[PDB]
Design a protein around this motif. Structure first.
Motif, short mmCIF file in Angstrom:
data_model
loop_
_atom_site.label_atom_id
_atom_site.label_comp_id
_atom_site.label_asym_id
_atom_site.label_seq_id
_atom_site.Cartn_x
_atom_site.Cartn_y
_atom_site.Cartn_z
N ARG A 137 5.65 34.66 -24.03
CA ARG A 137 4.70 34.26 -25.06
C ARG A 137 5.20 33.01 -25.76
NH1 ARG A 137 -0.43 36.46 -24.33
NH2 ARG A 137 -0.30 38.74 -24.31
N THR A 138 6.51 32.80 -25.72
CA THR A 138 7.12 31.54 -26.16
C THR A 138 7.75 30.83 -24.97
OG1 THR A 138 9.32 32.46 -26.60
CG2 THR A 138 7.69 32.62 -28.38
N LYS A 139 8.20 29.60 -25.19
CA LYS A 139 8.67 28.75 -24.10
C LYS A 139 10.11 29.08 -23.73
CE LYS A 139 5.91 24.83 -25.67
NZ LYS A 139 5.99 23.43 -26.13
N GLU A 140 10.77 29.87 -24.57
CA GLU A 140 12.13 30.29 -24.30
C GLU A 140 12.19 31.80 -24.16
OE1 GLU A 140 14.61 28.00 -23.85
OE2 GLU A 140 14.95 26.88 -25.71
N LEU A 141 13.03 32.27 -23.25
CA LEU A 141 13.36 33.70 -23.21
C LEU A 141 14.87 33.88 -23.12
CD1 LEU A 141 10.63 35.01 -20.71
CD2 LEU A 141 10.71 35.51 -23.16
N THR A 142 15.32 35.09 -23.44
CA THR A 142 16.75 35.39 -23.47
C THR A 142 17.38 35.22 -22.09
OG1 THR A 142 16.39 37.77 -23.06
CG2 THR A 142 16.46 37.04 -25.37
N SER A 143 18.68 34.99 -22.09
CA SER A 143 19.47 35.02 -20.86
C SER A 143 19.27 36.31 -20.10
CB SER A 143 20.95 34.83 -21.18
OG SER A 143 21.18 33.52 -21.65
N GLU A 144 19.19 37.42 -20.83
CA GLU A 144 19.05 38.73 -20.21
C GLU A 144 17.77 38.83 -19.38
OE1 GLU A 144 19.99 42.05 -22.62
OE2 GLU A 144 18.97 43.51 -21.34
N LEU A 145 16.65 38.37 -19.94
CA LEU A 145 15.37 38.45 -19.24
C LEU A 145 15.37 37.53 -18.02
CD1 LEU A 145 13.14 38.53 -22.43
CD2 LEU A 145 13.34 40.37 -20.74
N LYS A 146 16.02 36.38 -18.15
CA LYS A 146 16.09 35.43 -17.06
C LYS A 146 16.96 35.95 -15.92
CE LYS A 146 16.92 31.83 -19.86
NZ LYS A 146 17.05 30.44 -20.38
N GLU A 147 18.09 36.58 -16.24
CA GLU A 147 18.94 37.17 -15.22
C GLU A 147 18.28 38.36 -14.54
OE1 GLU A 147 22.31 34.50 -15.73
OE2 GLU A 147 21.61 35.86 -14.16
N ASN A 148 17.53 39.15 -15.29
CA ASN A 148 16.71 40.19 -14.70
C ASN A 148 15.71 39.63 -13.68
OD1 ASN A 148 15.98 43.15 -14.78
ND2 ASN A 148 13.97 42.25 -15.22
N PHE A 149 15.06 38.54 -14.06
CA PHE A 149 14.10 37.87 -13.18
C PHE A 149 14.78 37.37 -11.90
CE2 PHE A 149 10.63 35.50 -11.73
CZ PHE A 149 11.02 34.20 -11.47
N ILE A 150 15.97 36.81 -12.05
CA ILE A 150 16.76 36.38 -10.90
C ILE A 150 17.11 37.57 -10.00
CG2 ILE A 150 18.98 35.43 -10.17
CD1 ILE A 150 18.89 33.60 -12.64
N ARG A 151 17.61 38.64 -10.60
CA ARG A 151 17.94 39.85 -9.84
C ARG A 151 16.72 40.38 -9.09
NH1 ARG A 151 18.83 43.10 -13.72
NH2 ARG A 151 20.65 41.80 -14.23
N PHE A 152 15.58 40.43 -9.76
CA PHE A 152 14.38 40.93 -9.14
C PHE A 152 13.93 40.04 -7.98
CE2 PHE A 152 9.65 41.34 -9.10
CZ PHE A 152 9.63 42.57 -8.48
N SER A 153 13.97 38.72 -8.19
CA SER A 153 13.63 37.77 -7.14
C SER A 153 14.51 37.94 -5.91
CB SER A 153 13.73 36.34 -7.66
OG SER A 153 12.80 36.12 -8.70
#
Ligand SMILES: O=C(NCCN(CCNC(=O)c1cccc(O)c1O)CCNC(=O)c1cccc(=O)n1O)c1cccc(O)c1O
Ligand SMILES: [Th+4]
Length: 175
Positions: A137-153
């Motif tokens: 919803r904002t242009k930045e997200l936490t490191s945690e959410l980004k690493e989760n996205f990487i793991r999922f990918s």
């Protein structure tokens, strides 16, 4: 010719439980993007774009994407039609897209007011493409959410060079 990482089986793609279509509405920024035809380009990095979801009376979404390209705002409109389960959609008016025989959307996870992950799979010219978007919803997200996205990918078979974090911009997507 063309060589693609195979689409994962749908059994590897979770669905957000109890999906709430009204709460998913509004503007989402594309904070992360991964897929079998997505490639990192350090020469000219992907710019952030936004996708706006508006729920129609008939419970389909009007989905508008907004991108900054060649000094202008470029708009793309699609319709997502509710599929077999809440949080799953197919593409409306598929016949108006040449070569496209299949298009599937599955909302993997979201808390509606900060982040989501959405899986897309399409068959175009008989080639199977898939991507995953990390929405904020904002242009930045936490490191945690980004690493989760990487793991999922990666769990879907994508290497790191097929995972991109578009650079925040102000043009167009601040609408
Ligand atoms: O696909 C993109 N770039 C590479 C060339 N194309 C590949 C075909 N599309 C895709 O790979 C693709 C995959 C799933 C759903 C789609 O709408 C797609 O365009 C692409 C770029 C920016 C944002 C996106 O959301 C993209 O999908
Ligand atoms: Th597309």
């Amino acid at each position: 010719t063309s060589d693609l990482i195979p689409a994962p089986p749908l059994s590897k793609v979770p669905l957000q439980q109890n999906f709430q279509d009204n709460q998913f509405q509004g503007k989402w920024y594309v904070v992360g993007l991964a897929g079998n035809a997505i490639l990192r380009e350090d020469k000219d990095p992907q710019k952030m774009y936004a996708t706006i979801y508006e729920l129609k009376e008939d419970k389909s979404y009007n989905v508008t994407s907004v991108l900054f390209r060649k000094k202008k705002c470029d708009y793309w409109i699609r319709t997502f039609v509710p599929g077999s389960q809440p949080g799953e959609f197919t593409l409306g008016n598929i016949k108006s897209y040449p070569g496209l025989t299949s298009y599937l959307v599955r909302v993997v996870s979201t808390n509606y007011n900060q982040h989501a992950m959405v899986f897309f799979k399409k068959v175009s010219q008989n080639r199977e493409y898939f991507k995953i978007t990390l929405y904020g919803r904002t242009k930045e997200l936490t490191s945690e959410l980004k690493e989760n996205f990487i793991r999922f990918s990666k769990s879907l078979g994508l290497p790191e060079n097929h995972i991109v974090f578009p650079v925040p911009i102000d043009q167009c997507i601040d609408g």
